[PDB]
Design a protein around this ligand. Sequence first.
Ligand SMILES: N[C@@]1(C(=O)O)C[C@@H](Sc2nc[nH]n2)[C@H]2[C@H](C(=O)O)[C@H]21
Ligand SMILES: N[C@@]1(C(=O)O)C[C@@H](Sc2nc[nH]n2)[C@H]2[C@H](C(=O)O)[C@H]21
Ligand SMILES: [Cl-]
Ligand SMILES: [Cl-]
Ligand SMILES: [Cl-]
Ligand SMILES: [Cl-]
Ligand SMILES: [Mg+2]
Ligand SMILES: [Mg+2]
Lengths: 434, 434
Amino acid sequence: RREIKIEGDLVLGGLFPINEKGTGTEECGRINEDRGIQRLEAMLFAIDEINKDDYLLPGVKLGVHILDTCSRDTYALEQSLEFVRASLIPLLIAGVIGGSYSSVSIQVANLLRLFQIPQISYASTSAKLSDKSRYDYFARTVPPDFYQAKAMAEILRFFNWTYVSTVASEGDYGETGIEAFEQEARLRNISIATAEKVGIRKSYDSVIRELLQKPNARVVVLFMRSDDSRELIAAASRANASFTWVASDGWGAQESIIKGSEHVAYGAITLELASQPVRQFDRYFQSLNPYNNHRNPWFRDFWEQKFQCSLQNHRRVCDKHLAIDSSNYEQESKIMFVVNAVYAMAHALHKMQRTLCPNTTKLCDAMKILDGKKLYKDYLLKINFTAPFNPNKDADSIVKFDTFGDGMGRYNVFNFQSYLKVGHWAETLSLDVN
Amino acid sequence: RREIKIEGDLVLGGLFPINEKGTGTEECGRINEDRGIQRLEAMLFAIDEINKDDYLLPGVKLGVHILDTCSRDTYALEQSLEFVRASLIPLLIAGVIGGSYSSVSIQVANLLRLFQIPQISYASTSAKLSDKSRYDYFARTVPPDFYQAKAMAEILRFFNWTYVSTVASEGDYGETGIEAFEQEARLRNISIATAEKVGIRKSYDSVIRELLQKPNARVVVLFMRSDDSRELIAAASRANASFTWVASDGWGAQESIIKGSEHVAYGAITLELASQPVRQFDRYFQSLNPYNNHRNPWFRDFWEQKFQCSLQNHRRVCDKHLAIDSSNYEQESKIMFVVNAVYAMAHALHKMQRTLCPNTTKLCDAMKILDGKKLYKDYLLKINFTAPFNPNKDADSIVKFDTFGDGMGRYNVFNFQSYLKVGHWAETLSLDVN
Ligand SMILES: N[C@@]1(C(=O)O)C[C@@H](Sc2nc[nH]n2)[C@H]2[C@H](C(=O)O)[C@H]21
Ligand SMILES: N[C@@]1(C(=O)O)C[C@@H](Sc2nc[nH]n2)[C@H]2[C@H](C(=O)O)[C@H]21
Ligand SMILES: [Cl-]
Ligand SMILES: [Cl-]
Ligand SMILES: [Cl-]
Ligand SMILES: [Cl-]
Ligand SMILES: [Mg+2]
Ligand SMILES: [Mg+2]
């Protein structure tokens, strides 16, 4: 199999959806450029930055064992066995960075707790992962999706919107989120007219009718995914219904949802995961090409797929001058979370080495037989640090986890006109005038 | 490491506490003769009997991969990695037989569900293992300890004992059992005077006083372990209190508990796991000696430890004529459960091969890429068969599992005089005149 194995005094395992879930027969499909290639390179970028940082793990070199998940649960577990074979050629696995999808992260967390291997995910937002009776070694730099509920209800409780109607998607997201919203609304005196769930355009048209049948609530709180949100706005367009929507990140600040139904959408309050681009990362990512990137065994497949050419005769040959640049690259939204996950692990290990190895920077016999239980509970859960590549080194650039290992809730608010950043929800709400 | 690896068309993995949990530093201590050696040999005995049985898996040879757990959770998981490395030299692991202790079985179940490997335990009685949201691939031939509660309360509800007092041990056993009793008593109108829990002889003496403080209940339902039960009867002896005890298998029909306090114990109704000895097994077990048993790599250690001699110079040499016989061997209480667990797996696989391989006895390509999900839910959970070595082939010799994979509740009742078998509790109660 394909992998990135780089020796180090301590090794962080990594799991990324380098490939899309394979079609019917096959395990893996094409290369996931954004969630796969970029997120993987952001790990390598952070490891490289930590290994040049004399104030972080000055005498401990970080190594990596990066593996593809193929955006599948089973494939990720088979791969994860490398991290656990080690725990017993396999390396000194101090922790695991990943995965992306929550189904992957859940299955990996299930294997990892058995061997006391700390795990930080940069993208898995399911609420299930907050259950420490099941995922006791899991932590994440991204907040759980249920925090959007707390935030959305605060946007209502500010604007005193007490009589509100709700629509929710089917599955883990909609159901766990809306249930969290209901409970947070009940806590803040807010009432529900109709709780419509959604598993044909006529089905969404039926939901709009039930939303009209209670004309008392103008405010409709939405906790749906992208495709669901887009077809319920077109369903509100067909019936020409005028509702002020307060939607989750499934809608967010994207054009996909509002395409051809802009009129019915005006003045909708949406949520989006606040993230700041890692500038130094853009420079590193764009500098990569098949001539300089031999350490990534997927980079040639990535390149060949991106530029639709062959590096190697009925295929068109790749131009030696092709480049990842401003015309074809835009930093993936979760890069900041990948970098912060890697550094949280580095910060935890650095405080551990500092404590367990008095009068040395080097990995002493105590750290050599790593107590994962101690690393997670005593170091990882107790670290707070300014994000490494955040320009404004303020209180909202602090990387910390609550008692459940969940990252800090940081969402932005977006008004519709044209999406406009009308505020944020950190621990508390913030809005302007729109 | 030490192991029993025997090739077969299908392989059953096995886990047994061959060694006692090691002292402080060490992982493994001495050889557990009864729960380790015997239970392991009962697996090998059943595999041998199935491989001679032309009506059970006629054209599929069962192989084994038997490993030591060292009566530890971590050691069992490290070993279990052999079963999962296979699932991907490692063999075709169709299922796992074990472990003994519930902490071992819980940790193994946690690894095994990930790889869809069915698991049958012959001894793990914890209630936690009935939770299919956690242990979805686990089943057991032994019933969960909480069934004793249902049975004990029926002994009260027969004799109309409605005003009853309770004492419970600390930990998984006492607490889960007594809570199950309370709920089953509340269902049957029975009331509780004092619910005394127990984590010094004076501490048990305090409990007896609280039991006296409510002189209304003569009946005291006990859900404690052996050591706890023995010190609460001596505590009732010191204070000279006369209570009719209705106790769980922690007390059962053993002399250990009643030693020096026989008077206070008279007329106590105790529970014990009903099991019938496997006669053909006694013949096989006693026939074993270091000359004929090379397949068990622990048998020389077992022998050397049992007879306190060396097979190999300051140690006394083993007499070539020493033998496991009536003077030193008594079939371990759970042997029947080991044999039944192995056969339930064989019966499940046989019905699977029969269905998935029309017009052949041999392992066809469908069975070669085994669906553990199907084997467990569709075959293992749906098998019912007369116990292989049970003389009276009646309805109480049926090996079956409920929807949670739990084996059939079969306990015996024991009156004190001298312990006397005064009845049984199968699905319903049965008693005589005593
Ligand atoms: N938030 C995610 C999570 O699984 O927690 C969900 C998926 S996105 C998706 N695709 C279909 N439904 N949802 C992935 C996102 C990311 O990789 O940024 C994580
Ligand atoms: N019933 C058991 C289970 O763990 O389910 C409990 C232990 S016995 C024990 N020793 C200390 N406390 N309890 C073991 C018994 C067996 O091997 O027959 C299984
Ligand atoms: Cl993933
Ligand atoms: Cl979902
Ligand atoms: Cl065990
Ligand atoms: Cl216990
Ligand atoms: Mg450094
Ligand atoms: Mg046969």
